[PDB]
Structure formats: C-alpha cells, structure tokens
Amino acid sequence: KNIDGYFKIYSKHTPINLVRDLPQGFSALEPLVDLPIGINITRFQTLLA
C-alpha cells in the first residue's frame, strides 16, 4: 500500500502442502516494512529466476 508517501509492506511466510490452489484458511499480516518515498506508482511487475 502507499498512503501519504508511505509505502507499507505487510507480510507472512507459511509452510504449506498444496499443489495448484490457494489454501482455505485465515492468516493475519504483521506490519513489517514502511518506506517514506513519496511517488505515484501505477504499474508493477514481478521478476523470476
């Protein structure tokens, strides 16, 4: 998220046992990273190996 020039990154890692589906369950996100840049972002891409 990016509010008032603050980019917020909320994250979680979980060990799972599932092949092609998104797991049915509940999991809160701890707030982890905030970064005060101040830019207008419109598009985004991932990067693989």
Place this chain on the structure above:
Amino acid sequence: NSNNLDSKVGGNYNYLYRLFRKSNLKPFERDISTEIYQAGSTPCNGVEG
C-alpha cells in the same frame, strides 16, 4: 529573509516556481515536469506555441 544570502544584482533567476498547471495538487506532492501548459483550448506541440 534570505536577500543577502543568495540574491544577485542581475536578478536571481535560480529561484523558480510552477505558475501554470491544469489542476490543484494533492498534499505532500511535488512536480518537476516541464511540459508546456496549453493555456488556450488550441492544442499545441513542439517547443512553443
């Protein structure tokens, strides 16, 4: 006041401001874009108009 600090006798033209812009801006936002503002309804391209 900062008259004796940076103002030059030839006119300190290092100090600029954005006068012509189509819309008022969101708080804590900056713009360094220098694109020519069509103050008339006639669209204009190139280097002036």
